Amino acid sequence: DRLDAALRFQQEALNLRAQRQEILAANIANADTPGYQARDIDFASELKKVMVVDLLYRVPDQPSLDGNTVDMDRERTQFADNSLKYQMGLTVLGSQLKGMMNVLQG
Amino acid sequence: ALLNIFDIAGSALAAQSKRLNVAASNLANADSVTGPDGQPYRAKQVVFQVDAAPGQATGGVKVASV
């Protein structure tokens, strides 16, 4: 359907933002697990792949003794950024749907 | 990836965390006689550089090495 092609990009971006949000929250929740590696996804490459998931390990900053590589500050900033981008995607998708609607209303 | 302000402030947070970690490690090892090999502990320092991604305009803080 042509309607899907117009809204495909924003829907895929929104779904990818939700998945990465879940991954970041999993990183936050498992901060205290000894031996847990902080995982993340490269948003742009996966968005290419879906439009046309694989988890990448985060490069550790400080060496802990229990093997936990989760850094609070980095993932807190990433979490806030992902929340903001999810809201922006919701706004853009809603604007596109509302425009398609006011075209029809009459 | 990150918005510019997010990246700058998060880099600042990470750099301050690294400096605090270095200070805490130094304060812990204030009375250490030997390391794991047989050499004295040497006080660590952290050097802040400006991560000027564009030409001389702005940029957060990075830490080259301890």
């Binding site: 990448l56 985060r58 490069v59 550790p60 060496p63 802990s64 980095r74 | 794991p36």
Partner: peptide
């Protein structure tokens, strides 16, 4: 490379021995 980047390899285990092996 940079702390906070993305790599396809898990970091090596964080061992801290008390004496030289």
């Amino acid at each position: 490379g940079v702390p906070g980047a993305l790599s396809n390899q898990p970091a090596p285990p964080n061992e801290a021995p008390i004496a030289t092996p």
